[PDB]
Write a protein that binds this ligand. Structure first.
Ligand SMILES: O=C(Nc1cc(Cl)c(Cl)cn1)[C@]12C[C@H]3C[C@H](C[C@H](C3)C1)C2
Length: 169
């Protein structure tokens, strides 16, 4: 049984998925994701959802070098929920570069309407990165990786993974 305290101190990306897809007993399905730069209004990324072991749990992002100097980005997330009520829906997203923790985001979802489509806004406050780190992250695309742990009532129900490029394609 993995709880939030079990991931709040992780200093490395996990070597595997901490939970199976069947553990998503709340039928939580992310159907849309949009990232906006809060200092310019620019839509940095948008996706709409229409046997690989990842099965939709791994996403690869391709951003520009300017993304690493952003102060704050806004994430709009659309997701459906099953019949089971969802209380204390939490997401802990940890970003690492070459086994070095860079930032962890602890987001608490607002009320979730059961058996319906929900929309939430997550505000990411980026920390200032050292010039050496920014340079390395630009030179090494996809070596920046993240773990997104989703908790419902302190119980891990979803675990998604991603890697990032900041080389501007
Ligand atoms: O990729 C990142 N943040 C991100 C990515 C997405 Cl796809 C969304 Cl939705 C929201 N934030 C960062 C940028 C830099 C500052 C931290 C630590 C690392 C360097 C990785 C976050």
């Amino acid at each position: 049984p993995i709880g939030p305290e079990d991931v709040l101190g992780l200093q490395r990306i996990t070597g595997d998925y901490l939970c199976s897809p069947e553990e998503n007993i709340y039928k939580i399905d992310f159907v849309r994701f949009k990232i906006r730069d809060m200092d310019s209004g620019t839509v940095l990324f948008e996706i709409k959802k229409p046997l690989d072991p990842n099965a939709g749990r791994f996403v690869r992002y391709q951003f520009t070098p300017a993304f690493l100097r952003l102060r704050q980005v806004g994430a709009t997330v659309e997701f459906t929920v099953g019949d089971k009520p969802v209380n204390n829906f939490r997401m802990i997203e940890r970003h690492y570069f070459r086994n070095q923790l860079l930032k962890s985001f602890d987001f608490h979802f607002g009320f979730c309407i059961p058996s319906s489509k929900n929309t939430c806004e997550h505000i990411y406050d980026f920390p200032p990165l050292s010039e050496e780190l920014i340079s390395e992250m630009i030179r090494h695309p996809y070596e920046t990786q993240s773990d997104s742990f989703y908790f419902v009532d302190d119980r891990l129900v979803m675990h998604n993974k991603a890697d990032y490029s900041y080389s501007g394609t």
